[PDB]
Amino acid sequence: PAPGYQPTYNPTLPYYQPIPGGLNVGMSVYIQGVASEHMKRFFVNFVVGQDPGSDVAFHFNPRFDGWDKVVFNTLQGGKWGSEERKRSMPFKKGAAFELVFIVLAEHYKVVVNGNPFYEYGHRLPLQMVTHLQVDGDLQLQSINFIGG
Ligand SMILES: [Ca+2]
């Protein structure tokens, strides 16, 4: 079922749902979860459409092979762009987290546990984004959309 502006508790992964009202400036996405002890995969995508192969305006991808880092990128016309990386890891083994994306005119502002983490500049117009996709072997307590 499509989300509204009330929290969705214990969503099942993989999660792939339409953003209520489409994506607009001022909107925030709140994700409460726990980064599992044996978590190997985790990503959040702001997607243009619901079909496989759809463009991804913003791919947010904590990575753990070798040195831990968070990767940020865009998939457009079947092509991945130049990767951005932040060489630090704000998620901790087995630890609860609050992950927030605030959609501003210039960038997605990413805040983790109340601490500003990154600002991903828009590459595709943010208004093209229609769906939120989340997957990984972690446990989500809730996903919540706050309208702008
Ligand atoms: Ca590692």
Residue numbers in the entry: 5 to 152
Quote the study's own text.
To elucidate the full structural architecture of galectin-4, we solved the crystal structures of galectin-4N and galectin-4C at 1.48 Å and 1.78 Å resolution, respectively. The final models for galectin-4N and galectin-4C are comprised of residues 5 to 152 and 184 to 323, respectively and share the same structural features previously described by Bum-Erdene and co-workers. The carbohydrate-binding site is located in a shallow pocket composed of residues present in the S4/S4′, S5/S5′ and S6/S6′ strands and the S5/S5′ adjacent loop. The residues involved are His63/236, Asn65/238, Arg67/240, Asn77/249, Trp84/256, Glu87/259 and Arg89/Lys261 in the galectin-4N/galectin-4C structures, respectively. Structural analysis of both galectin-4N and galectin-4C domains, which share a root mean square deviation (RMSD) of 1.2 Å between Cα atoms, reveal a large difference in charge distribution when the electrostatic potential surface is calculated at the physiological pH 7.4. The galectin-4C surface charge distribution is mostly positive, whereas, the galectin-4N surface displays a more heterogeneous distribution with a positive region localized in the binding site. Arg45 in the S3 strand from galectin-4N has been identified as the main residue to interact with a cholesterol sulphate ligand and to contribute weakly to lactose-3′-sulfate interaction. Reference curves resulted in sigmoidal profiles with respective Tm values of 55.92 ± 0.05 °C for galectin-4, 56.8 ± 0.1 °C for galectin-4 N and 68.12 ± 0.05 °C for galectin-4C. In contrast, the larger RMSD values observed during simulation reveal that galectin-4N can be more plastic, a characteristic that allows this domain to be more promiscuous in carbohydrate recognition and binding, as well as more potent in achieving a biological response.
